[PDB]
Amino acid sequence: GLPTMNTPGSNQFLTSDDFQSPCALPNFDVTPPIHIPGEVKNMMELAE
Amino acid sequence: GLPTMNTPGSNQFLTSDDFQSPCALPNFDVTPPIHIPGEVKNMMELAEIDTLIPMNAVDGKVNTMEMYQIPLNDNLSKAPIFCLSLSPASDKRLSHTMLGEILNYYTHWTGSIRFTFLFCGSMMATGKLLLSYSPPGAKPPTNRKDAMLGTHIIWDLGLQSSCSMVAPWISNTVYRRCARDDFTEGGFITCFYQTRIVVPASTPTSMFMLGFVSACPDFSVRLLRDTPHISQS
Amino acid sequence: GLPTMNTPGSNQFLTSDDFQSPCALPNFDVTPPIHIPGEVKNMMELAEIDTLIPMNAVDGKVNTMEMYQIPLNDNLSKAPIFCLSLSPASDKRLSHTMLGEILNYYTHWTGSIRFTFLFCGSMMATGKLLLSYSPPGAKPPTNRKDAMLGTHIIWDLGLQSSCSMVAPWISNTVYRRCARDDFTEGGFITCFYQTRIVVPASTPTSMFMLGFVSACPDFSVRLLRDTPHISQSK
Amino acid sequence: SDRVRQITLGNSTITTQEAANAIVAYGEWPTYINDSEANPVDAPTEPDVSSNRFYTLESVSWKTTSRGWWWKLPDCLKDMGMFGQNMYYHYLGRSGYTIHVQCNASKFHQGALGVFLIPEFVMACNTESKTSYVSYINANPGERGGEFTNTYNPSNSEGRKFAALDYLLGSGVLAGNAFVYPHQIINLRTNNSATIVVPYVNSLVIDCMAKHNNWGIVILPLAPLAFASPQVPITVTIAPMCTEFNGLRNITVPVHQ
Amino acid sequence: VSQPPSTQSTEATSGVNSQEVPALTAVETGASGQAIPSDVVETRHVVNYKTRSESCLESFFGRAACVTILSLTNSSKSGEEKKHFNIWNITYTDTVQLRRKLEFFTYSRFDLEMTFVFTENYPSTASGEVRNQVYQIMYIPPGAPRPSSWDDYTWQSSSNPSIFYMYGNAPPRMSIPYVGIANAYSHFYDGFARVPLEGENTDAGDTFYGLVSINDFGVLAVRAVNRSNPHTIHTSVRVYMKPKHIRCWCPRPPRAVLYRGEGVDMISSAILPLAKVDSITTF
Amino acid sequence: SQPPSTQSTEATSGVNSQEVPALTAVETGASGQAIPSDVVETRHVVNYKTRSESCLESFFGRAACVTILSLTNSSKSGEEKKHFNIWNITYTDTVQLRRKLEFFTYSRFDLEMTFVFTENYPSTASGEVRNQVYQIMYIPPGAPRPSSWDDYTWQSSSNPSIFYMYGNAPPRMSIPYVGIANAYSHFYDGFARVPLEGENTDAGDTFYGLVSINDFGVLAVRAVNRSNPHTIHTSVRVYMKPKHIRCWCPRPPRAVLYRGEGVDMISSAILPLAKVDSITTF
Amino acid sequence: PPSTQSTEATSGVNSQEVPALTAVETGASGQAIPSDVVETRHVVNYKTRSESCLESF
Amino acid sequence: FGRAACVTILSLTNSSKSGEEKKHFNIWNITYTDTVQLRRKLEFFTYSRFDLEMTFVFTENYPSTASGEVRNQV
Amino acid sequence: GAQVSTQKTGAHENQNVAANGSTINYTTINYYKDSASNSATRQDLSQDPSKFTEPVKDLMLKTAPAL
Amino acid sequence: GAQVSTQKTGAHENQNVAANGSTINYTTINYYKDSASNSATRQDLSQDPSKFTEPVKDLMLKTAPALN
Amino acid sequence: GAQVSTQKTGAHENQNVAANGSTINYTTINYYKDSASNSATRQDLSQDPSKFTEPVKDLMLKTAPALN
Ligand SMILES: CCCCCCCCCCCCCC(=O)O
Ligand SMILES: CCCCCCCCCCCCCC(=O)O
């Protein structure tokens, strides 16, 4: 076993937490995207 | 599934640690910097600034503006004008100067200390003063002879009124404690008249001088600590 | 993020651990080193220093200065005049010497041991002593004959006031226990007169010898252990 | 020699015979806002002559019983002619300053005055209950400025005013550490004046003059005005530097007393 | 991989009979004299490898400090719902040691780390069993809606960040980027939020002079997440905060008197920072 | 390369020469130098044994218990002061460690500190008590010390500290060498102050020795949790080891049990050795 | 990264073609910016629209 | 010889009684001979040379009728 | 297999040019077979507001008569 | 995408000039999207006290008469 | 930026030369900025006993009589 140390912040859930996680459905075949008119990239495009 | 082992120290909070931590606001745009004047990089840049010594914290002068005024007289005197113990973070008068206050956040320190004195007398008055520093472990100067024996400088009254003296870094240890210590003391600072102040007619027969203290360029500190000066209920 | 598995031994404290840990005092300036004289790098450097053997263990000479003074007389005698059990750490006479104390921090030891003697009698007196080491598993060296059968030197007293006898590392085991292990018997160190001390008229007829013990260069120790020589209240 | 200096700005000049060289806060000369650092988007007003000229504030008397004087810098100049009009006509603005303080005396006079410039000179409320802060009017003395005291009398006109011991600079700090701020000293024995060049200093590039006092001016006796009571006048004269404004609007008229 | 610079070294220096002597100057100029011992006394050469690492602003302000203590109660009585959660203004004002360090500068710019140390005890002799609880620390930026109770919709936190922590686990931690509006945070504000105009109250400004009216970074909302128990349990959060990646501007004097309140205002009972000495000549 | 081994034995035959490594003089201050190849006929022996466990780093490489502090978290008002415990920084509390450290007059090292916690209900009646977190903080000499467990100084704005939940891995921290000298001294043959003519007729009795000279501040350990109806006795053990260590100027081991922090002896224990019936008794 | 739009310095306009006038009946939004409406100064604008990305929203 | 085997059982007691304080600790001679399956495997050889690793398993109960709160022990 | 990307500018980072130093970069590795397991992707700062603000068949300039 | 930097000197270093080889180094990797998540910055000891102790428009030399 | 070194041998290992097999290899990375946080140093088997056992100003030989 590789020596490690858990720092503060361990075992916590932040709603803005951005990390990797296991797939609930391994190898799931995702429906191909199609072009749909009206693509939005940013909320500011609507602000204008 | 990389095998790992949690070593002691795991799952503890150290207030002085340095670990990475995820941002709670991902991709947040930080207000761009501008060139704000007066940038400080280090606390020592402030340690080198001359501030006044509240030297005259004596009855009737305690906690007032007059506390910073060192009296002078034109009469004969063999007595010291003033005495300080060189303990910049523990002396009652020095722990409150900027040097002392920055230093109150440190445990240990080194380097030389500079003192500057200024005559705020009339232009008409003349004479000379003896500024002197005596290293630790000996009877502190009691008179002018002792003052002449140790390190000293003669400060004449003149147009370049200000005069500095440097208490050189003489120490057994490399660093001294900031804290008052029976073992470690910084020696003594005194001042005596070299000669009587000569005062012309219709000229004040009493004056004041101001004293300042600051860090020398070889000055440093070792470890951050809580200060005793601020408290809270 | 990265999948991991905690193994046995996780979240335990071992006094023998050698792991990194965060500094409680970040960016601290460590007072620069200077060339301090007398550097020691290894405990064996101290093991090799000759120290005195508290040989005179007879009641009344114990825990006093005389404890290190071995009497000699010019009286004719064939008696043994010295008896050590060798175990540097367990022999009551050796366990308190520096070599013995260093070994009381270790479980096992190896290498040859040197015994050095100094004659402190008159300049006028002369004579010869038999210094001998007898390997274990044998009848103790009752007399000079047995001492002669074992490993020995003769110390001819003269200008060179001292001599050294070496008890070579003869052992069945590679290492012996520091502990009083009857299995790893030390052997015997003894001394007999080779000849009566010759003392001319008008000199002392009773004199002292000092003895020293030290490690030889092939000496070493193994596992570290608590020493039984120190204690305290709870 | 360095003792004699002449400062020219706009359409007015100060000539001084005995100045203790000169100070620039932080060694930073005032400049105009760069394109790389700007909030306003409108073309700026740059009234260089009308604003960057010296103006004199009413002088004060130095007595042996004086404990100090103070001003808020843009406040003391807020009604100052054409400069003052631009301050009231625009929402935003920025300026540096040249502050020249002069106090003449005979060679037979003794004493000293320290001049310190404090960014963000926030003063303590006088009243102990601390349930009320200082009103706009009381907080902004105008050209006359205010004064320091030597006693604290926090009675619950007092309720809404600033008060400051000279001793603690109205800030709760010791006055002896005031030297941390850009400063120069007028020692009557050595010089008649002090000159400090002041850059605009804020967390913002530009700000609103009617709301914020970028700097304050603190003048304290350091040594008594001994003479063999005496009185000596102190005059403070100030000019804006690199003045610029943004956000032109109708005239702003503050609450009056 | 360069060697860091040291503090000033000393060159061996002989005594002098110079007619140009650095000992005298004119402090009136606003400039400090610069004498180092070699300018005053005879000195030896000294190799100086000492540094100012511990005094870097990053190191000075590099420690987490307790900034506030919040408390909440998990109980089941008719008058206790309001005590289930705690709403607090974000500020460093609450604790004096950190505030004083920050007050050395007029302006500062930094990122922050927030660390929360949780504890609990029984305020009541019932001493009954309770389950390990989950606590929620939600941040509500200014102008965002606030909860009326601990059990409300705002706790959904769909846009607001929020952290859920279990008691007994490592203290939770998160990073906050500089969020100031200005290009630095101001520690002081010599001004008003608004300008009372001619058509106003004479005392206007009494409710808003100072930083107290412009500094608003929202609140933290802390609640036990767990439904209440028959046995009351009292809990609290010691909030720790640390400056990181910090730079400061425009140094000023440290506070000499007991703080009190939100401004710089002192109290009459604590306006005397120094001790008395019987004499000017006493060592 | 290969870790250097201890001395190998060269083979040798009988010697009838006049070189005499067997005889010497120790009066010179030198130790005897003889080895088996000087004294007896020998065989060649290859020696690969390594003096690694005798390196000073190894010798001092294991953490020792240094101190045990007693804290009690209790609701009784008369026991409130027991909620926290302030200990002087020292290694003089435990004898096994002092014994080894005091072998050298001087040393330089970094220090590893760890803690071990355990708790019980010292009272007659146990009951539900929640998991406590402990706050360990260092208060350097000159730093203010708390008068109470809830004293504002536990803000720890500068003083470094650790918050540990009972039951998680024992806490650990590294401390760099902190001497103000170029080495820690383990001894001090001197006085903090030099009494001068006049003053105190015969001063120094209250300030002789290392015990006066090196003030390392205190370690303050508090419970962080408020009190409970049922109270807890909590024991904290402090463990230490030198790491990255160098030593100078070796000394004899102590024979006498230490009479505390000085070098003082108790009259009841100044007899370190057992007797043997005689010189000639094995 | 891509950034938001900057402001160019401008002066007085006596153009027969005016950007401030339009007709929202077309369904297009008005397109005028401050530099078209008033005289402006040059401004470098780094206030990047990252928080507003759908991925962040 | 690739698997760990149980080699001994030690008994520790936390005692609230005036007696059995001595049961708070247990000193065992190190050996593998308490266990027959392991010694039999080792005894296939006259001589052996190996490094050894040890793992411990702790388990505890409340043996008395008077059950009540006990803090987690170390 | 690790990727290296530039971090969002912090409080005391370099100039807005975002091209100064190696200390502004971060490293990330995907640990799963399913891309749905990846942490959020990088933000796309590309925008095209004309799609909704000027969807006019016949393009017009700002100063052109609207009608 | 790691960086390797030297460490501040400890007790065992006989090189207070940080010149004892590869022996003294540490490795750091940033693991987060924002730099606000990075550990504390590299130490920077550059200083310039003249900003606060001698902010004089006129250059003064230490042996110069302060005023002529 | 990992450093490597020879591991001490064990039961199934090679001779005391420790040169046989690349498999005897302990790998380490320092994770902290202060070297005081690093694990213990490499064994230093350098020895100099003469400082304590033969600090004689004169050149003394073992075969020469100690005295003369
Ligand atoms: C989910 C919890 C998020 C925590 C939000 C804490 C925000 C801290 C920054 C706002 C205060 C800035 C002014 C200051 O430094 O005091
Ligand atoms: C946050 C924990 C910091 C504690 C610092 C206290 C100093 C530890 C060293 C104590 C031993 C000094 C004397 C010696 O090593 O010989």
Numbering used by the authors:
A (entry chain o): 1 to 48
B (entry chain k): 1 to 233
C (entry chain g): 1 to 234
D (entry chain j): 10 to 165, 169 to 240, 244 to 272
E (entry chain i): 16 to 298
F (entry chain e): 17 to 298
G (entry chain m): 19 to 75
H (entry chain a): 76 to 149
Paper text:
Non-polio enteroviruses (NPEVs) from the family of Picornaviridae are nonenveloped viruses composed of (+) ssRNA genomes that infect humans and cause a variety of human diseases. For this proof-of-concept study, we selected CV-A21 viral strain responsible for a substantial proportion of enterovirus-associated acute respiratory tract infections in humans. Herein, we introduce an EMPEM pipeline for rapid structural analysis of pAb responses elicited by enteroviruses using whole viral particles. Using a combination of nsEM- and cryoEM-based polyclonal epitope mapping, we identified two primary immunogenic sites on the surface of CV-A21 located near the 3-fold and 5-fold axes.
We resolved two distinct polyclonal antibodies targeting Site-1 and three against Site-2. We next relaxed atomic models into the pAbC1-1, pAbC2-1, and pAbC2-3 cryoEMPEM maps. Given the polyclonal nature of bound antibodies and the inherent lack of sequence information, the variable Fab domains (Fv) were represented as poly-Alanine models. Site-2 is particularly interesting because it is in immediate proximity to the receptor binding site (RBS) for CV-A21. While antibodies targeting Site-1 are distal from the RBS and it is unlikely that they would interfere with receptor binding as Fabs, antibodies against Site-2 sterically block ICAM-1 from accessing the RBS and may be able to suppress viral entry. Site-2 pAbs display high similarity in epitope and angle of approach to 1D5 mAb, and a partial overlap with 18A7 mAb that binds directly on top of the 5-fold symmetry axis. Importantly, all pAbs bind in a manner that does not block the accessibility to the symmetry-related neighboring binding site.
